Amino acid sequence: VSVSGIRKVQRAEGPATVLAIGTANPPNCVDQSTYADYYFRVTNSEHMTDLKKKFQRICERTQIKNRHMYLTEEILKENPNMCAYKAPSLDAREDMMIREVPRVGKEAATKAIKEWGQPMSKITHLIFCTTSGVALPGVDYELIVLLGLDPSVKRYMMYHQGCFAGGTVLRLAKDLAENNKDARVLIVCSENTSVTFRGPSETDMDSLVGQALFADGAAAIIIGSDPVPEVENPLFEIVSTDQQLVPNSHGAIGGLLREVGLTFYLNKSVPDIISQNINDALSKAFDPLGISDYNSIFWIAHPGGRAILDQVEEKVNLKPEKMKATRDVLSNYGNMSSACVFFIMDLMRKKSLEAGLKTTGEGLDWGVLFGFGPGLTIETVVLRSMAI
Amino acid sequence: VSVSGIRKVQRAEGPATVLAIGTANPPNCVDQSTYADYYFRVTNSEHMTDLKKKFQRICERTQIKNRHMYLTEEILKENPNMCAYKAPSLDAREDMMIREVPRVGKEAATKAIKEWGQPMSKITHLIFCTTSGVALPGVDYELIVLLGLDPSVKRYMMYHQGCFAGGTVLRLAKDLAENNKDARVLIVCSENTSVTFRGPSETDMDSLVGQALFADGAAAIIIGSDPVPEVENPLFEIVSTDQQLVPNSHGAIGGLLREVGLTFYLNKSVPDIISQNINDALSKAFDPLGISDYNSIFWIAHPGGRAILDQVEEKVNLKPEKMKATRDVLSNYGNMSSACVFFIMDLMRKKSLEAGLKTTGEGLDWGVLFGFGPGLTIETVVLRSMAI
């Protein structure tokens, strides 16, 4: 009768809170210090002698030591079109994407749900964020089946978002959890390189650089407002979440879905673009909270690349350590796109707890989470750590 | 300092409300009573004599009289791969999709914004829902540029959702508008058939049926909680929004993104699946509100096809008229996927007002909005009409 009364009683009351986290990747670990050779070998670009040495240089300064990858030297054999620079292979890539994406996402979810300790039945919303794997019904549908979620879970299929999608989900999860009482949201960001992998091109360097970065791996996050005492354990609270487009950026990061898989460009000016726009976002989100010292807060930045980390650290003037967790994930996993920030969040708390610190935010109270991607989008999420 | 206080002051207070609507389609109107010939002509499937007559039969019982289409007999000439049943054409289709989708979406938005009367600067969120046109940054990015939206508008790129995406956006818009004070959301659902069009196959009937249904057209909807008196005009209020998966449905509606464009299947059992599951959703959403007579409320159903309309009307026992608006849109526009429901909502109020009725819901107070799509998803949105 009263849309006003229904509203008043059906809305959550507190801020969105991260209650559990889970992560998993393809078993196959690929070593970085020997990737340049492996790569030029299975692509048969050995005669590109120069480009090869040049690729080891890249792989070295990569700051990455390991990366999980579904694609194996075997899977690459049965798929010649995927080893070539540009060759019709969209169908093959998508089929691996569609099969493997939900599969790994479920492994991450199970771990998260086990931690959370609650019954799946309680999951009210589902946010599935993947770079690709287009099918109707989508990847989320498969996840519901595999996992056995409720047939009335409200779904949100985020396709082809970009490396900044990490903050996107949190931004979206916030409103879902905070507007509906008992809303418990499941975030699953599964990224797989089956669509971005291809052979080298003497003319396409941007593409050659991505081959040394992108890795595989999923992450499941349980989010919900008004934590049940004792039963549920809050880890972090979503305080605020902004998104922003930097002018003159479209040509920086991007790509298209072609018949030869996902193509992409990464302009060298990225670390700069971020560095020269990162402060405005910082102030925009911490001024309202009286924070001026960006060292008094913990950090979780999307490891788009080492250079980005060096530049932001250099501009904002952060002690080394601030980026220790972030770099730590990059080194053992590489750039799993939207998944990285949650592997870092998981790493931060897991360590803070094994260190005896007073909070999950490296003993600190406030922290910021970034996300960097296409059109040069920046997503600033402000977090509030939880005690003990 | 108090994530509890920030929350208390930054949240909207009333229910999400539709304040303006705008729609636009490709100028090119294609006549249905002569489509079977046109279609078999530009595809060069004239020798398929039987299939051709069979296609006119389909086109006739279609219940569609007109459909706007970007694709012209000229554009089809310069694109032989798109006239063939299955032929590598993903790149061409996507490029039209990417260029035309945002373009038409902006025309719809301008009209909506003009109506709303407020400055664009006030648009806080952007929900872009299209069946395809994959690029990074995505179609939403382009819309921001074309339209001149703020560089900090929170974006939500809904790609490849399905014919049920109409309710999806409303479901999502609700939480956005209702959780953030002053949040004014822009919903743009632009659907274009450049990706689903192809030639006939003596073996692929499901595909032949879609060629007689799918049309072009965009729709922009302004949504926001706590209407400004006099300045803003509320049209409908979002009361509740559920989503549901019918067991044993995946094979009913669906499709994949292939190198030959978007493929799709439409199983004849759909009108049944809906009809035999439509009541549960109805009760689920109207019982809490004491509504038992589904004729005492106005209706806005996704015109997935005439048969679906006939079956639901037959099961629920609705006077003819209940589906008069819905069928009216289908006849002049066809199935523009996620756009249809908003062209119907626009049509309902536009007529109710020119009829002298007391509300925008055909003089009634409550109404329901449906959405039907892949994996056989049903989205039940309950609306509350606005006065005069």
Ligand SMILES: Oc1ccc(/C=C/c2cc(O)cc(O)c2)cc1
């Ligand atoms: O598992 C994966 C992890 C990361 C990626 C990379 C995606 C991507 C594609 C682009 O067009 C732009 C880029 O900035 C991001 C692909 C697979």
Ligand SMILES: Oc1ccc(/C=C/c2cc(O)cc(O)c2)cc1
């Ligand atoms: O403008 C357009 C309007 C509608 C469509 C149809 C999309 C579609 C594709 C499928 O796999 C399943 C189907 O149920 C829906 C495409 C373009």
